[PDB]
Amino acid sequence: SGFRKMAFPSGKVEGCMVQVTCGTTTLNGLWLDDVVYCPRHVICTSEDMLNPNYEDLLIRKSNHNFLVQAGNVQLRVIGHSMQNCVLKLKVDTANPKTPKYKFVRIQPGQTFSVLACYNGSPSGVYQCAMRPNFTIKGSFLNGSCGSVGFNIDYDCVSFCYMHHMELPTGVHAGTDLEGNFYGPFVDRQTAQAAGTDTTITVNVLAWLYAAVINGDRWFLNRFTTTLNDFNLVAMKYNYEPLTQDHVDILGPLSAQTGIAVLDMCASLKELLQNGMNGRTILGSALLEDEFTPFDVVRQCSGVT
Amino acid sequence: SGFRKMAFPSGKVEGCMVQVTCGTTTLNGLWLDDVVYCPRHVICTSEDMLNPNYEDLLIRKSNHNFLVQAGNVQLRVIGHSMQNCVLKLKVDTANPKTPKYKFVRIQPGQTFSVLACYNGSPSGVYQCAMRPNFTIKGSFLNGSCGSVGFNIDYDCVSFCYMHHMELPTGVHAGTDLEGNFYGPFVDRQTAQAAGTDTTITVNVLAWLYAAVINGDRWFLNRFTTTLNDFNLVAMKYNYEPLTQDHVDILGPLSAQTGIAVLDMCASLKELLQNGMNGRTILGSALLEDEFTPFDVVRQCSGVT
Numbered sequence A, B: 001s002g003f004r005k006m007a008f009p010s011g012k013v014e015g016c017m018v019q020v021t022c023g024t025t026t027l028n029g030l031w032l033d034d035v036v037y038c039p040r041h042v043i044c045t046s047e048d049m050l051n052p053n054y055e056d057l058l059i060r061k062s063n064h065n066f067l068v069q070a071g072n073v074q075l076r077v078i079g080h081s082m083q084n085c086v087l088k089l090k091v092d093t094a095n096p097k098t099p100k101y102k103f104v105r106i107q108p109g110q111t112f113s114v115l116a117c118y119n120g121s122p123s124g125v126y127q128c129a130m131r132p133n134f135t136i137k138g139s140f141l142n143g144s145c146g147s148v149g150f151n152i153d154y155d156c157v158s159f160c161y162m163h164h165m166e167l168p169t170g171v172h173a174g175t176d177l178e179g180n181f182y183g184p185f186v187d188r189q190t191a192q193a194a195g196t197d198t199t200i201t202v203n204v205l206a207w208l209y210a211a212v213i214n215g216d217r218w219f220l221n222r223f224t225t226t227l228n229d230f231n232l233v234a235m236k237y238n239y240e241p242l243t244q245d246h247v248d249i250l251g252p253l254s255a256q257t258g259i260a261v262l263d264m265c266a267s268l269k270e271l272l273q274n275g276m277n278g279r280t281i282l283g284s285a286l287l288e289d290e291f292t293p294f295d296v297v298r299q300c301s302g303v304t
């Protein structure tokens, strides 16, 4: 028992991190097979971030201008190309530590682990959620760009995120591994405000089921609700509207605990209306929304 | 910016996890050089956990009774010995993935990452603190025993914890890598209650400095306090008494922010007395105590 914000073991990803330097700028790259993936803003100078013309900036760069170092060994760059907001540096050596992998574009509300890196070296790993407003609340300092987000299914690493920027609000924006930004963000040093950060209702419910499984049950009540009644309350508290698809994914947790999804919704409704009253749930004094129903099942069953 | 409960990259530890089976029981072992370390209760049956005589139980076991598998390859056991509550299985092959390592016995209040494993395979990584009552609030299911806690300094892995048991209260107990239990716990299926779980005051203060660095400052006040005045309040709220050594370790954070340690203590005092008033600090509605002053500095500087 016990419930923790658990990240995937990062070893398979650590073996892919490299350092990419272009002129004065150094950031992280992801080396898979004979390609190194990195944010295209690696080619930008101080007077560029303001309004960069990446096509015009990339014209002044050749294969030899991109310095890729893996550990203490230099990789030879034989090709370079821009795909949306990422650069793909073709190297002459396939990464011998390349795991089985996929590039996936995750849905808002889904979770992933981030391996924060600096100068191609890993510093830490933590679990994140893609917010409904397509930002992530990460922990990144200058030099962390190119750090990636991922999920792992047995031996396959699904890369879903690459870190590119920090908005003036301290939240983070980035792309999938095809270089497409999550949300409306652009790789430009401009005021870009994130939209309303709504709570991932399906995840809070999954976490409430995790709490019941692990012994925290004070919040269980004698009430029930309907999807429409619950959604009226969810709207007021800037919670995502719950759908029948959400109810369906909560099915295994509902079956395991014997608490119908709508009864758990009624517990959530009362917690939203009345607060925690100074109490805690799984060591938290607020409703946790960064565990999907899949994460709860995985952690409560021990999937390796 | 941003602040997260970050764990160390687990790759160096993943390469050490093996599966150890003795009779019907399977748990995790740690393979470093030519030795596999695992909890000695791997030799116990159902009618043993109640009151096991490990010396008498180990007498009926030979090198061939301990099955050690690393991935899909079997290791040959050429020696076995019991050191306190761990078994040391000498194997004929040095682990080719053995990192530079140390065995350290951590102090209560210090933090570490846990690589949770099942059948020698890693499932996840999370950050823990050794509670002042020598328990850890982990996430472990049956089969997780032998999972280890560790810290990493550049390339050196300091192993500090090995998981052995879950107390009837859902908290976890374990040993250092010499097999000595943290706290008064014994590897026996008996009621063993943990003592009072006090809050790690030096860590809450370090987290409050992390909050100021990352922009959360509503809790800063116009007051100050003394060590004795603060400790009167800390006693009432089951917080660890703050010492001059604690003040000294908070020194770099105090210097970075320009907020004297005793002024931060006065903010903590008011938060203890008046609560959060429905507000949050670094996305938490309670005072976080599982970040040491070293963790805050490391995360806020980007040590890899």
Ligand SMILES: O=C(Nc1ccc(N(Cc2ccsc2)C(=O)Cn2nnc3ccccc32)cc1)C1CC1
Pocket: A024, A025, A026, A041, A044, A045, A046, A049, A050, A140, A141, A142, A143, A144, A145, A164, A165, A166, A167, A186, A187, A188, A189, B001
């Ligand atoms: O100034 C340089 N580069 C350089 C500067 C800023 C950035 N930007 C914005 C940007 C994006 C596309 S263009 C400009 C970031 O937000 C990067 N970021 N991400 N997480 C951060 C956390 C803290 C601080 C910065 C962080 C990206 C690149 C060269 C070294 C001289």
Ligand SMILES: O=C(Nc1ccc(N(Cc2ccsc2)C(=O)Cn2nnc3ccccc32)cc1)C1CC1
Pocket: A001, B024, B025, B026, B041, B044, B045, B046, B049, B050, B140, B141, B142, B143, B144, B145, B164, B165, B166, B167, B186, B187, B188, B189
């Ligand atoms: O029953 C067997 N072994 C077997 C049973 C219990 C245990 N024990 C207590 C114990 C310790 C020394 S003696 C008995 C644990 O607390 C292990 N633990 N740790 N985390 C857990 C989280 C959830 C459940 C159990 C957990 C250790 C070993 C053999 C497979 C048949």
